[PDB]
Amino acid sequence: RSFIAAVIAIGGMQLLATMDSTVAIVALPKIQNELSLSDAGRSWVITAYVLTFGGLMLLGGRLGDTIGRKRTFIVGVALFTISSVLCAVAWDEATLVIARLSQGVGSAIASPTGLALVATTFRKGPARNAATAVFAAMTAIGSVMGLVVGGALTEVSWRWAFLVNVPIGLVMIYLARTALRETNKERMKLDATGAILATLACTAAVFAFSIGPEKGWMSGITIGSGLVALAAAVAFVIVERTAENPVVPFHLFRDRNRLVTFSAILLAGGVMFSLTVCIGLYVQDILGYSALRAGVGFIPFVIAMGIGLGVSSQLVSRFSPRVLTIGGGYLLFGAMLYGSFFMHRGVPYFPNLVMPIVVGGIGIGMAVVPLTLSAIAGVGFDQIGPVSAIALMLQSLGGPLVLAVIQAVITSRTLYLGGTTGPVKFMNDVQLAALDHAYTYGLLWVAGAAIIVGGMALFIGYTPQQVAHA
Amino acid sequence: RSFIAAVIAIGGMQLLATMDSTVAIVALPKIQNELSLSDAGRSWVITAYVLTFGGLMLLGGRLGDTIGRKRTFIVGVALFTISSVLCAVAWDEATLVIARLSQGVGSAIASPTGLALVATTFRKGPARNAATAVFAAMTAIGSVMGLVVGGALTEVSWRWAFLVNVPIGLVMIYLARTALRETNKERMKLDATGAILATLACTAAVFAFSIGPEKGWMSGITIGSGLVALAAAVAFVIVERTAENPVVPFHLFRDRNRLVTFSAILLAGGVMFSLTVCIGLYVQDILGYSALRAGVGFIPFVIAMGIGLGVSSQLVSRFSPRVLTIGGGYLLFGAMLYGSFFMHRGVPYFPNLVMPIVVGGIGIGMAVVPLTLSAIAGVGFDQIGPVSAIALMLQSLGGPLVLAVIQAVITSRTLYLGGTTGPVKFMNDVQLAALDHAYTYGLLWVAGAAIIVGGMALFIGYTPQQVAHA
Ligand SMILES: CC/C=C/CC/C=C\C=C\CCC/C=C/CCC(=O)OC[C@@H](COP(=O)(O)OC[C@H](O)CO)OC(=O)/C=C/CCCCC/C=C/CC/C=C/CC
Numbered sequence: 001r002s003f004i005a006a007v008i009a010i011g012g013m014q015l016l017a018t019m020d021s022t023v024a025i026v027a028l029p030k031i032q033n034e035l036s037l038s039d040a041g042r043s044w045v046i047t048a049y050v051l052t053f054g055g056l057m058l059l060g061g062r063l064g065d066t067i068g069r070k071r072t073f074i075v076g077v078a079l080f081t082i083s084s085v086l087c088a089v090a091w092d093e094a095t096l097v098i099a100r101l102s103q104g105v106g107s108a109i110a111s112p113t114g115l116a117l118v119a120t121t122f123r124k125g126p127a128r129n130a131a132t133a134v135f136a137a138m139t140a141i142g143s144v145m146g147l148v149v150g151g152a153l154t155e156v157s158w159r160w161a162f163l164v165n166v167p168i169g170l171v172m173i174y175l176a177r178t179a180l181r182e183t184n185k186e187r188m189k190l191d192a193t194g195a196i197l198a199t200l201a202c203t204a205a206v207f208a209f210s211i212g213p214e215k216g217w218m219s220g221i222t223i224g225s226g227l228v229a230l231a232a233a234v235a236f237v238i239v240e241r242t243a244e245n246p247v248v249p250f251h252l253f254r255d256r257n258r259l260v261t262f263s264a265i266l267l268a269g270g271v272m273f274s275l276t277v278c279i280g281l282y283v284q285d286i287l288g289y290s291a292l293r294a295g296v297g298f299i300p301f302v303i304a305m306g307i308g309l310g311v312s313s314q315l316v317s318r319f320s321p322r323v324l325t326i327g328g329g330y331l332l333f334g335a336m337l338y339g340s341f342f343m344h345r346g347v348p349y350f351p352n353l354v355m356p357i358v359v360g361g362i363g364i365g366m367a368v369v370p371l372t373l374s375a376i377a378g379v380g381f382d383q384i385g386p387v388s389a390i391a392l393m394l395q396s397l398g399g400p401l402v403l404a405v406i407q408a409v410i411t412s413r414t415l416y417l418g419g420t421t422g423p424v425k426f427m428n429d430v431q432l433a434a435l436d437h438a439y440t441y442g443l444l445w446v447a448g449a450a451i452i453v454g455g456m457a458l459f460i461g462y463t464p465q466q467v468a469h470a
Numbered sequence: 471r472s473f474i475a476a477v478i479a480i481g482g483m484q485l486l487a488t489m490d491s492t493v494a495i496v497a498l499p500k501i502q503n504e505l506s507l508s509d510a511g512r513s514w515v516i517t518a519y520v521l522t523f524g525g526l527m528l529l530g531g532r533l534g535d536t537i538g539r540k541r542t543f544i545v546g547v548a549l550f551t552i553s554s555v556l557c558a559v560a561w562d563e564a565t566l567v568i569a570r571l572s573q574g575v576g577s578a579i580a581s582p583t584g585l586a587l588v589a590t591t592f593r594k595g596p597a598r599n600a601a602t603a604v605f606a607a608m609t610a611i612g613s614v615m616g617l618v619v620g621g622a623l624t625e626v627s628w629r630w631a632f633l634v635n636v637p638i639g640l641v642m643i644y645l646a647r648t649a650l651r652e653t654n655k656e657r658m659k660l661d662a663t664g665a666i667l668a669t670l671a672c673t674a675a676v677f678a679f680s681i682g683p684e685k686g687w688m689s690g691i692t693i694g695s696g697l698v699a700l701a702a703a704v705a706f707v708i709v710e711r712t713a714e715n716p717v718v719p720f721h722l723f724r725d726r727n728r729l730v731t732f733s734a735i736l737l738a739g740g741v742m743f744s745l746t747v748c749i750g751l752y753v754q755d756i757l758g759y760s761a762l763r764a765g766v767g768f769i770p771f772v773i774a775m776g777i778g779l780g781v782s783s784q785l786v787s788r789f790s791p792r793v794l795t796i797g798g799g800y801l802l803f804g805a806m807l808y809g810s811f812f813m814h815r816g817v818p819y820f821p822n823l824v825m826p827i828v829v830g831g832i833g834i835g836m837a838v839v840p841l842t843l844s845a846i847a848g849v850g851f852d853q854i855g856p857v858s859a860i861a862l863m864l865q866s867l868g869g870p871l872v873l874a875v876i877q878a879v880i881t882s883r884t885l886y887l888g889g890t891t892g893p894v895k896f897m898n899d900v901q902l903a904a905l906d907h908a909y910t911y912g913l914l915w916v917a918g919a920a921i922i923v924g925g926m927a928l929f930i931g932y933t934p935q936q937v938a939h940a
């Protein structure tokens with residue numbers, strides 16, 4: 001039981017954080033009808049979590065080296081679980097935003113430690129390959145369970161949806177206490193000066209990006225915050241040259257395979273994030289399956305993805321990460337080509353929608369394990385901290401960049417085919433049909449980004465005896 | 471002057487075959503007004519040329535070994551030039567059909583000899599690379615010059631357009647005679663039984679594939695035509711086992727890098743053929759440029775292609791055919807993504823149409839040179855005949871296969887967007903707008919087929935020392 005209890009506990013924060021993201025999105029309209037927070041406050045509950053989760057990520061990367069990775073994992077999760085209760089008792093806009101702020105602080109501390117715990121706890125070999133599959137398995141499980149939970153326990157109250165994290169979170173705190181052993185190495189000094197500038201630079205950059213669309217791109221306060229971030233970013237690099245125990249080891253990023261792998265995960269995250277957002281919007285708006293029925297209909301995705309991850313964990317020892325990334329990428333290509341020809345409003349569920357989801361899930365799951373193992377290959381125990389923190393930063397940061405281009409193509413083609421921009425419930429059956437054909441057309445431009453991802457994967461060059469097979 | 475006159479004469483049949491093909495398509499509607507051979511006779515003049523050109527392709531490969539490579543190239547061109555004069559004096563469908571039949575026979579003899587002449591005449595190294603670029607360069611020149619000649623000298627008569635091949639064709643016979651030296655090796659016995667079975671199989675398959683859409687797929691004679699095609703093909707393989715100097719050396723095609731490099735050009739030719747048909751139809755119908763203006767507007771394509779071919783000849787000695795094929799093909803991906811977003815009816819010619827054509831021309835030209843050098847590498851002199859005939863047979867055969875799939879996607883999406891199937895001259899500006907967006911949508915599926923070509927190009931693995939640099 002020691003093995004299964006360890007992989008479940010380590011990947012728990014991936015289950016918790018991803019599930020919370022979808023439930024908060026689903027319950028947003030009912031928050032309007034109760035708190036009466038207006039349209040300006042609608043975005044302030046979402047970006048409040050993102051403000052601290054991305055701002056504190058680098059600080060939480062080096063936090064486990066000076067205190068302890070296991071202690072960091074329990075503390076970070078506990079603050080996440082406590083914050084959910086404070087989120088479900090919110091009475092005023094100030095109460096909710098502060099509750100969402102502290103969830104990001106709790107997530108930023110524990111999330112990078114989860115990836116680092118895979119490399120240190122499990123030795124290189126079949127154990128790490130099985131641990132990588134489980135770590136990637138429950139990220140998609142939380143997303144699907146988020147739709148089912150958020151689509152079922154929402155008509156009685158949005159407050160009960162946030163209270164489902166507590167039973168799940170308490171188990172992972174219990175499992176991590178009795179299934180993970182505290183390692184014994186001497187603690188190292190924290191880069192306090194480096195962490196101060198790194199935190200205030202990423203938080204300012206996210207604040208400027210969020211306030212842009214609201215107050216205008218050239219309001220005067222947005223540029224002022226960007227100037228502060230650019231001044232901090234310049235100073236942060238300067239100190240790191242002669243700073244012991246760097247937050248970011250720039251010397252570790254050379255012309256080696258590390259840049260190619262870290263550039264691939266930056267773009268591969270954007271392809272996956274944009275694919276999830278567009279498919280969920282297409283099913284809920286064009287097909288009208290709502291939250292509950294869409295989540296149950298995505299159950300085959302988890303089973304197919306679980307099949308792909310389990311198979312890829314066996315083949316990684318024999319095949320290089322280059323061929324498994326491409327091999328699973330071609331199964332993705334056939335899914336969205338078949339998912340473009342056979343999608344309009346009113347099609348049956350089994351002949352038309354089941355196959356693209358199942359086949360695409362196997363291809364996606366096949367290429368996740370080789371990419372994860374190569375990003376934590378040949379780094380060591382003193383430097384696995386910041387490397388894991390950077391890997392989760394680039395994976396999440398690439399999402400909005402790619403989706404911004406994809407959503408621009410969707411909007412442009414809607415106008416050309418004949419349509420309007422606005423809420424969907426106010427669109428007759430010619431502007432609605434144009435939006436149907438716009439999303440399907442934009443599914444092919446997602447494949448255009450996937451080709452770019454695969455082209456960068458040609459330069460990995462890792463052999464199977466380095467990433468695995470030890 | 472010896473070098474430039476030699477290579478021009480070698481690639482001369484490529485100029486003739488492509489340019490005559492385009493002119494025959496352009497002047498087809500005027501043949502209706504004069505010969506009055508009805509709809510059923512419209513497709514016979516196109517079918518008649520293809521029936522013998524593809525039917526006698528395999529015979530022409532081994533015909534140069536038993537007779538002479540230079541002598542075969544002269545008679546093949548001479549019969550082509552002669553048949554153009556008889557074509558332009560046609561006075562009934564029977565006279566025009568016979569002339570088109572004889573034009574294919576002359577082309578089937580000289581076309582495979584042109585590619586074989588590249589390998590034997592020029593020694594492997596810098597001389598072959600420069601000769602390869604000019605060989606591919608004049609294939610694209612003939613296509614554009616066919617539009618201008620057939621779009622300008624056709625308002626006076628369709629008979630004058632057919633007589634423009636004689637001044638050019640007579641020059642090619644002169645340059646070949648003066649600038650090509652007759653090699654001195656002993657002639658070999660021709661496989662009489664194999665040549666008879668090879669000829670009958672291809673014409674029967676072409677005849678069945680042509681009468682199918684006309685008379686019905688299960689009409690009764692198409693299955694009979696398919697019966698002799700299978701009977702000839704089955705006996706051809708049986709008798710080829712013990713046949714001296716085989717027509718098709720099956721033993722040469724093993725699990726080595728030759729089957730991969732022959733499957734790539736099978737589908738690369740289909741992508742390039744479907745790109746020309748779709749673009750030419752889109753420009754003439756949606757934009758209404760007619761034939762003369764379309765030919766002038768595609769002049770920058772040839773200039774851009776010439777730059778791509780010239781650069782690729784220098785780089786092929788330092789880079790393998792794998793990287794140049796994948797690297798050159800990414801420029802094609804960028805052009806067709808740009809050409810899908812910024813191309814509708816009524817756009818200016820400069821910013822929206824010239825840029826994708828110029829960039830796409832460079833990308834195509836960079837990938838053509840490595841593919842043909844790999845297709846004639848390391849075979850010898852006693853087997854360069856059949857191998858070059860197969861390379862031209864598969865390149866032409868892949869065209870209709872890929873285009874049939876693309877045209878099915880275009881027709882399916884036209885109906886969904888709102889529109890009908892029929893002549894463009896009866897549209898109510900609403901079905902015309904839908905046909906505009908259907909062609910643009912189908913441009914991305916051509917990119918999907920080009921991705922498959924890239925995938926097979928990863929298995930080439932030819933060293934630049936083997937295909938060049940000697
Ligand atoms: C090593 C460093 C880091 C490693 C750490 C990383 C470790 C592993 C991570 C891997 C990737 C992400 C995990 C997966 C998360 C989400 C996936 C999921 O399970 O979530 C369900 C849904 C989301 O939706 P959701 O966002 O909730 O929607 C709500 C709206 O926003 C408003 O309510 O996604 C999907 O089903 C995905 C479907 C793609 C399959 C391919 C189909 C192609 C053809 C389909 C045609 C249909 C027509 C579409 C026409 C466009």
Ligand SMILES: CC/C=C/CC/C=C\C=C\CCC/C=C/CCC(=O)OC[C@@H](COP(=O)(O)OC[C@H](O)CO)OC(=O)/C=C/CCCCC/C=C/CC/C=C/CC
Nearest residue numbers: 606610613746747748750751752809826830842861865909
């Ligand atoms: C070694 C083995 C063998 C080696 C032996 C062979 C050695 C090398 C041979 C390679 C392949 C063929 C060469 C090229 C031949 C044709 C190309 C050409 O020069 O011909 C011009 C025109 C043809 O037209 P044509 O067919 O005459 O038209 C008539 C109508 O059918 C009815 O009159 O094509 C083009 O301009 C091609 C443009 C492609 C550039 C990239 C475009 C991307 C953006 C597109 C946006 C536009 C919107 C499209 C929306 C869909």
Ligand SMILES: CC/C=C/CC/C=C\C=C\CCC/C=C/CCC(=O)OC[C@H](COP(=O)(O)OC[C@@H](O)CO)OC(=O)/C=C/CCCCC/C=C/CC/C=C/CC
Nearest residue numbers: 322323326327328451452455456458792793796797800928
């Ligand atoms: C095969 C097993 C099972 C099959 C089983 C078959 C059944 C179905 C299919 C299964 C999966 C397919 C396998 C995909 C394999 C691909 C990986 C690969 O085999 O790769 C080849 C080559 C080797 O490399 P090399 O190390 O020399 O050789 C060592 C090896 O031969 C062994 O040791 O990779 C390259 O170099 C790539 C060359 C292209 C140059 C890049 C330029 C274009 C991109 C520009 C910028 C990027 C994008 C930016 C913005 C767009």
